Enzyme design. Structure first.
Site, PDB file in Angstrom:
ATOM      1  N   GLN C  15       0.819  -1.208   0.000  1.00  0.00           N
ATOM      2  CA  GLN C  15       0.000   0.000   0.000  1.00  0.00           C
ATOM      3  C   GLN C  15       0.855   1.261   0.000  1.00  0.00           C
ATOM      4  O   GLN C  15       0.458   2.273  -0.588  1.00  0.00           O
ATOM      5  CB  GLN C  15      -0.956  -0.020   1.194  1.00  0.00           C
ATOM      6  CG  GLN C  15      -2.066  -1.058   1.028  1.00  0.00           C
ATOM      7  CD  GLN C  15      -3.049  -1.092   2.182  1.00  0.00           C
ATOM      8  OE1 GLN C  15      -2.811  -0.509   3.240  1.00  0.00           O
ATOM      9  NE2 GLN C  15      -4.164  -1.785   1.981  1.00  0.00           N
ATOM     10  N   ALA C  99       0.766 -15.017   6.370  1.00  0.00           N
ATOM     11  CA  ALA C  99       1.643 -15.409   7.465  1.00  0.00           C
ATOM     12  C   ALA C  99       0.977 -15.299   8.828  1.00  0.00           C
ATOM     13  O   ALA C  99       1.576 -15.719   9.825  1.00  0.00           O
ATOM     14  CB  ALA C  99       2.913 -14.553   7.448  1.00  0.00           C
ATOM     15  N   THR C 145       4.430 -11.449   6.909  1.00  0.00           N
ATOM     16  CA  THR C 145       5.079 -11.363   5.607  1.00  0.00           C
ATOM     17  C   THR C 145       6.125 -10.253   5.587  1.00  0.00           C
ATOM     18  O   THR C 145       7.259 -10.464   5.145  1.00  0.00           O
ATOM     19  CB  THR C 145       4.034 -11.122   4.517  1.00  0.00           C
ATOM     20  OG1 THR C 145       3.008 -12.119   4.602  1.00  0.00           O
ATOM     21  CG2 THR C 145       4.681 -11.167   3.138  1.00  0.00           C
ATOM     22  N   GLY C 146       5.758  -9.062   6.064  1.00  0.00           N
ATOM     23  CA  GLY C 146       6.702  -7.960   6.074  1.00  0.00           C
ATOM     24  C   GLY C 146       7.983  -8.290   6.810  1.00  0.00           C
ATOM     25  O   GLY C 146       9.061  -7.824   6.429  1.00  0.00           O
ATOM     26  N   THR C 179      -2.428  -4.269  14.407  1.00  0.00           N
ATOM     27  CA  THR C 179      -3.385  -5.359  14.403  1.00  0.00           C
ATOM     28  C   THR C 179      -2.951  -6.519  15.286  1.00  0.00           C
ATOM     29  O   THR C 179      -3.686  -7.507  15.388  1.00  0.00           O
ATOM     30  CB  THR C 179      -3.583  -5.878  12.970  1.00  0.00           C
ATOM     31  OG1 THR C 179      -2.466  -6.689  12.588  1.00  0.00           O
ATOM     32  CG2 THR C 179      -3.721  -4.721  11.989  1.00  0.00           C
ATOM     33  N   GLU C 254      25.952   9.107  -2.486  1.00  0.00           N
ATOM     34  CA  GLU C 254      26.889  10.052  -1.888  1.00  0.00           C
ATOM     35  C   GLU C 254      26.486  10.398  -0.459  1.00  0.00           C
ATOM     36  O   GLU C 254      27.341  10.474   0.432  1.00  0.00           O
ATOM     37  CB  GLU C 254      26.979  11.313  -2.743  1.00  0.00           C
ATOM     38  CG  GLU C 254      28.226  12.137  -2.478  1.00  0.00           C
ATOM     39  CD  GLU C 254      28.539  13.089  -3.612  1.00  0.00           C
ATOM     40  OE1 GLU C 254      28.403  14.315  -3.413  1.00  0.00           O
ATOM     41  OE2 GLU C 254      28.918  12.613  -4.702  1.00  0.00           O
TER      42      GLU C 254
HETATM   43  N1  GTP Z   1       2.124   2.876   7.383  1.00  0.00           N
HETATM   44  C1  GTP Z   1       1.372   1.809   7.123  1.00  0.00           C
HETATM   45  N2  GTP Z   1       1.440   0.702   7.946  1.00  0.00           N
HETATM   46  C2  GTP Z   1       0.677  -0.389   7.688  1.00  0.00           C
HETATM   47  C3  GTP Z   1      -0.172  -0.399   6.599  1.00  0.00           C
HETATM   48  N3  GTP Z   1      -0.794  -1.594   6.585  1.00  0.00           N
HETATM   49  C4  GTP Z   1      -0.373  -2.342   7.627  1.00  0.00           C
HETATM   50  N4  GTP Z   1       0.530  -1.597   8.322  1.00  0.00           N
HETATM   51  C5  GTP Z   1       1.264  -1.997   9.531  1.00  0.00           C
HETATM   52  O1  GTP Z   1       1.744  -3.333   9.415  1.00  0.00           O
HETATM   53  C6  GTP Z   1       1.696  -4.018  10.664  1.00  0.00           C
HETATM   54  C7  GTP Z   1       1.152  -5.432  10.479  1.00  0.00           C
HETATM   55  O2  GTP Z   1       1.811  -6.058   9.401  1.00  0.00           O
HETATM   56  P1  GTP Z   1       1.120  -6.155   7.950  1.00  0.00           P
HETATM   57  O3  GTP Z   1       1.967  -5.484   6.895  1.00  0.00           O
HETATM   58  O4  GTP Z   1      -0.259  -5.542   8.004  1.00  0.00           O
HETATM   59  O5  GTP Z   1       0.981  -7.737   7.678  1.00  0.00           O
HETATM   60  P2  GTP Z   1       1.512  -8.392   6.306  1.00  0.00           P
HETATM   61  O6  GTP Z   1       2.747  -7.682   5.806  1.00  0.00           O
HETATM   62  O7  GTP Z   1       0.415  -8.369   5.269  1.00  0.00           O
HETATM   63  O8  GTP Z   1       1.859  -9.917   6.690  1.00  0.00           O
HETATM   64  P3  GTP Z   1       0.712 -10.878   7.284  1.00  0.00           P
HETATM   65  O9  GTP Z   1       0.791 -10.893   8.792  1.00  0.00           O
HETATM   66  O10 GTP Z   1       0.902 -12.281   6.760  1.00  0.00           O
HETATM   67  O11 GTP Z   1      -0.632 -10.345   6.849  1.00  0.00           O
HETATM   68  C8  GTP Z   1       0.856  -3.163  11.613  1.00  0.00           C
HETATM   69  O12 GTP Z   1       1.642  -2.752  12.710  1.00  0.00           O
HETATM   70  C9  GTP Z   1       0.413  -1.949  10.806  1.00  0.00           C
HETATM   71  O13 GTP Z   1       0.619  -0.755  11.523  1.00  0.00           O
HETATM   72  C10 GTP Z   1      -0.250   0.705   5.762  1.00  0.00           C
HETATM   73  O14 GTP Z   1      -1.006   0.698   4.792  1.00  0.00           O
HETATM   74  N5  GTP Z   1       0.528   1.811   6.031  1.00  0.00           N
END
Ligand code: GTP
Ligand code: GTP
Ligand code: JEL
Ligand code: CA
Ligand code: MG
Ligand code: MG
Lengths: 59, 421, 440
Positions: C15, C99, C145-146, C179, C254
């Protein structure tokens, strides 16, 4: 320059090896975790066989 | 998608299950023929969760309804939305269980269980990506108790990596005079502790006291107790059934609510039985808990809260902060940020705004002690124990269920007395 | 050449990627169909904007990007969104089951099922490049995942691309929009695993961005959409040096020479100004001196920490828009004699400056005022370790009781990975504490 090649290669190498044993150790652990769960459910099956069986040994 | 396969078993499981389906079929705008007659694409964005889409555009509950006596299911198909169910998904027996757990688990249920599993499979393998299963049943009867927990063991064998939730109804002498109920409840718990991920403890002791004392309904029917349960069931599944800021499947929600595998027994709540402050005040009040337990006698490991209706979401955030600050001693300090909140802008039928509560509290041990008291009173007399050894069971199996449930209570106490240092 | 490939992982990465690429298109005059009327070289070019965009023979300018998630609903909105024509369908990769906020599932259980496909698709972009510079990885610390998949990917990219540079934009978790209760666990696990494989990581504290939206754009309860549009502006400022050219332009590598004194000390603090609503920007131009001062006022930082109680190892100022060195030098001189800027004794104290002329752009119907000039400060400060300390302490509270650890062990992990990860963070915190000590 030879030292730099050697150092880029060893880093690539050890990263490949460190990852490969991690994925193997994780494969081993997860399997040994699901199998243990199944085997408790199969000891469960025998037990239930012994309960239906003991009841027939009651008439 | 992410579909759930629903199962209802026994007297109680089928009664509360039917009402469950009337409320949520209502909300999603689907008549007892199965045709969408709503006004919001929102009512369909997660319609896969609980429905199969059939030919001629008819949504069919992914529900499997089960019993050991045909009477109770006759009422469902004749009751409202009875013609909506998949007719083949009716799996009944003839020789009932007689409020006996061994009949439901080992002997009579063991004979019917495989034909239930066939229905499970047919529904399961048609899902794009099945989340898991949810069961409605009682722990006091014989079919929902012993066959419900037998069917859980069998499903966890064939779907060992799927989530298994239950709305388990705990027995109380204030609703059902049936006397062997503490025997049944204790043997079921010894199962749910091992093979479920998420168990909502619906307590008739409670449900009676709320109709009696808050809704002011002396002589409360089971239809009155279920009216509360159906509102609880609709509330905790609201996030799953509608699109909001939260996109969470069954596993993700179990992950953030179950810090310890055995301690997955939740006391739910509902409010109103309004303004955001008092809505929040009411729902943390012990008088709105569907489990006969006082949260101020233990500590919260984790808490989920679901508000519904148009409301200032800034005020909800401020008021949840307020409650945590004023009640900090009752939330364990070694799990940071253990209270999560969800807001669905679609309110339930009748209410402009409501709140549903899910609590993983160590005070649930109070429940498990009431049952354990009534169980051990009977057990050392051996009262009505011949009904169980008749079906082939052993005195030892009783004692383990007792000790394994005494173990669970102490474990709740261990984490209630733990400190950060 | 000098192509950069962006990889967006998980909901937050994807996103934020949506926000960034929409912003890039507006900055470069690229339409949602990918056409770019001002590009007279059809099918290719060596222009500055080609570091991020390839060209098809049909005139389509295509992001050099891959979107990855273990779940389809987020990337589906990309496939059906305003900019769906901008991406080849093979740049958008989705599994079926996510995940579940579990690092183990992102790294081992679910992640291993798709990593080969992801690397295949990344290679397809790299082979298009004549001079590949490196990767930009967008992800959350908190998601399964992140955190889990990202680290798996970073390990694999090191194997397949050697010491080709890898930069991160990482979303540091905040309770106001989390979440999940287990995010501290995932944060330490991915940080430990990724540390050797990242050359530079820009952390974004969701709380810092949440507060800025509330305080400066007067949004009562900000959404991810509000947050991401602001995050895009910071990301755009950091990458602007790669996508535009100018005499005064200083190219991100740089700045990196200055920002990374040791390999592990590679987490710069970003501060951005001006963030201002349209109501308040009317009849009020923010000068170079005014936006430069805003960089040293901690409420404008991407990460909540106090640089005034720490020491500087580097300070970079990245200007865009109506700015000339004359103004910048006066503003810096003013600041240097009035603010709490203490450098470590082993670093020069000068501020390194870059200027892009192309003015800041805003999304239609955003909450940011369109401004004539903006600045992004990149500082290497010991104070950023406060963010590690806050997370490490949340990790410690839960791990003492092993709260939630069974979820990770059930997917194949061991307690040893947890303690090893936390020990790395303790050393990382101590490294930041060592760099600030004076010499002998
Ligand atoms: N800045 C920002 N943070 C986000 C957004 N969506 C989720 N987050 C953050 O991501 C964290 C949770 O990880 P996610 O990225 O939602 O989960 P994922 O990467 O889809 O991995 P899964 O757990 O498998 O769903 C939370 O602490 C949220 O604050 C967004 O659109 N913008
Ligand atoms: N809340 C609620 N509880 C019910 C309802 N019907 C039965 N019960 C509960 O169920 C418990 C006893 O179990 P049963 O209802 O007999 O369920 P069962 O296992 O199917 O028993 P069988 O009729 O022999 O099949 C009692 O404690 C009741 O409180 C109901 O409609 N609503
Ligand atoms: C599906 C979902 C749930 C809800 N579980 C849940 C929710 C949230 C959470 C953790 N867990 N954290 C949250 C934060 C914010 C908002 C919500 C949550 C429970 C369930 O179990 C049953 C079992 C039998 C039934 C039934 C439901 O309906 C009819 O019969 C099934
Ligand atoms: Ca061109
Ligand atoms: Mg019955
Ligand atoms: Mg996701």
């Amino acid at each position: 320059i030879q030292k730099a090649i050697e150092e880029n290669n060893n880093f690539i190498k050890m990263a490949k090896e460190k990852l490969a044993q991690k994925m193997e150790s994780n494969k081993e652990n997860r399997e040994a975790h699901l199998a243990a769960m199944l085997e408790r459910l199969q000891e469960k099956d025998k037990h239930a066989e012994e309960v239906r069986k003991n009841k027939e040994l009651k008439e | 998608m992410r579909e759930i396969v629903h199962i209802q078993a026994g007297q109680c499981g089928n009664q509360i299950g039917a009402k469950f389906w009337e409320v949520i079929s209502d909300e999603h705008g689907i008549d007892p023929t199965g045709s969408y007659h709503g006004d919001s694409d929102l009512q369909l964005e997660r319609i896969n969760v609980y429905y199969n889409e059939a030919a001629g555009n008819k949504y069919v509950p992914r529900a499997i309804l089960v019993d050991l006596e045909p009477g109770t299911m006759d009422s469902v198909r004749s009751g409202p939305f009875g013609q909506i169910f998949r007719p083949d998904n009716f799996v009944f027996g003839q020789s009932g269980a007689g409020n006996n757990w061994a009949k439901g688990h080992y002997t009579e249920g063991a004979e019917l269980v495989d034909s239930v599993l066939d229905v499970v499979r047919k529904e399961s393998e048609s899902c794009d990506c099945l989340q898991g299963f949810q069961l409605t049943h009682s722990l006091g009867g014989g079919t929902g108790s012993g066959m419900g927990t037998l069917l859980i063991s069998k499903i966890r064998e064939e779907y060992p990596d799927r989530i298994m939730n239950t709305f388990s109804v705990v027995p109380s002498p204030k609703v059902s005079d049936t006397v062997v109920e503490p025997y049944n409840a204790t043997l079921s718990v010894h199962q749910l502790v091992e093979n479920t991920d998420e168990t909502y403890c619906i307590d008739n002791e409670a449900l009676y006291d709320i109709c009696f004392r808050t809704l002011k309904l002396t002589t409360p029917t089971y239809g009155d107790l279920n009216h509360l349960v159906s509102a609880t069931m609709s509330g905790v599944t609201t996030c799953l059934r509608f699109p909001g800021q939260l996109n969470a499947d069954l596993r993700k929600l179990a992950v953030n609510m179950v810090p310890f595998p055995r301690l997955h027994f939740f006391m739910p709540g509902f409010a109103p039985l309004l303004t955001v402050p008092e809505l929040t005040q009411q729902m943390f009040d012990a008088k709105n808990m569907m489990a006969a337990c006082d949260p101020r006698h233990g500590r919260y490991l984790t808490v989920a809260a679901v508000f519904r209706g148009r409301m200032s979401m800034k005020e909800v955030d401020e008021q949840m902060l307020n409650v945590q600050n004023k009640n900090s001693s009752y939330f364990v300090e070694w799990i940071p940020n253990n209270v999560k909140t969800a807001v669905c802008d679609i309110p339930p039928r009748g209410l402009k705004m409501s709140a549903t509560f899910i609590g993983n509290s160590t005070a649930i041990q109070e429940l498990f002690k009431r049952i354990s008291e009534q169980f051990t009173a009977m057990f050392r007399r051996k009262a009505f124990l011949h009904w169980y050894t008749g079906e082939g069971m052993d005195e030892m199996e009783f004692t383990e269920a007792e000790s394994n449930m005494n173990d669970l209570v102490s474990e709740y106490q261990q984490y209630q007395d733990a400190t950060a240092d | 050449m000098r192509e950069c490939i962006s990889i967006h992982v998980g909901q937050a990465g994807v996103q934020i990627g949506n926000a960034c690429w929409e912003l890039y298109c507006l900055e470069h005059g690229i339409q949602p169909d990918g056409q770019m009327p001002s590009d007279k070289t059809i099918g290719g070019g060596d222009d500055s904007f080609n570091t991020f965009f390839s060209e098809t023979g049909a005139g389509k300018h295509v992001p050099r990007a891959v979107f990855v998630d273990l779940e389809p609903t987020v990337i589906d909105e990309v496939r059906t969104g305003t900019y769906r024509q901008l991406f080849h369908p093979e740049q958008l990769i989705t599994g079926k089951e996510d995940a579940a906020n579990n690092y183990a599932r992102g790294h081992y259980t679910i992640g291993k099922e798709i990593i080969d496909l992801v690397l295949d698709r990344i290679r397809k972009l790299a082979d298009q490049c004549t001079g590949l510079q490196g990767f930009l990885v967008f992800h959350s610390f908190g998601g399964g995942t992140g955190s889990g998949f990202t680290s798996l990917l970073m390990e694999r990219l090191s194997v397949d691309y050697g010491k080709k540079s890898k930069l991160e934009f990482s979303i540091y978790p905040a309770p106001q929009v989390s979440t999940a209760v287990v995010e501290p666990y995932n944060s330490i696990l991915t940080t430990h695993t990724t540390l050797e494989h990242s050359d530079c990581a820009f952390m974004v504290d969701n709380e810092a961005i949440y507060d800025i939206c509330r305080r400066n754009l007067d949004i009562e309860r900000p959404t991810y959409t509000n947050l991401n549009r602001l995050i895009s502006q910071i990301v755009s400022s950091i990458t602007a040096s790669l996508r535009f050219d100018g005499a005064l332009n200083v190219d991100l590598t740089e700045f990196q020479t200055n920002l990374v004194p040791y390999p592990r000390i590679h987490f710069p603090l970003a501060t951005y100004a001006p963030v201002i609503s349209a109501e308040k920007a009317y009849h009020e131009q923010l000068s170079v001196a005014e936006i430069t001062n805003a960089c040293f006022e901690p409420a404008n930082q991407m990460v909540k920490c106090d640089p005034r109680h720490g020491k500087y190892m580097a300070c970079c100022l990245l200007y865009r828009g109506d700015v000339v060195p004359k103004d910048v030098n006066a503003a810096i001189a003013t600041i240097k004699t009035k603010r709490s800027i203490q450098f470590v004794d082993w670093c020069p104290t000068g501020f390194k400056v870059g200027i892009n002329y192309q003015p800041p752009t805003v999304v239609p119907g955003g909450d940011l005022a369109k401004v004539q000039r903006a600045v992004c400060m990149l500082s290497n400060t010991t104070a950023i370790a406060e963010a590690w300390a806050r997370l490490d302490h949340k990790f410690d509270l839960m791990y003492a009781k092993r709260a939630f650890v069974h979820w990770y062990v059930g997917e194949g992990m061991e307690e040893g990975e947890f303690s090893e990860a936390r020990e790395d963070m303790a050393a990382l915190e101590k490294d930041y504490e060592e760099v600030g000590v004076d010499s002998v």
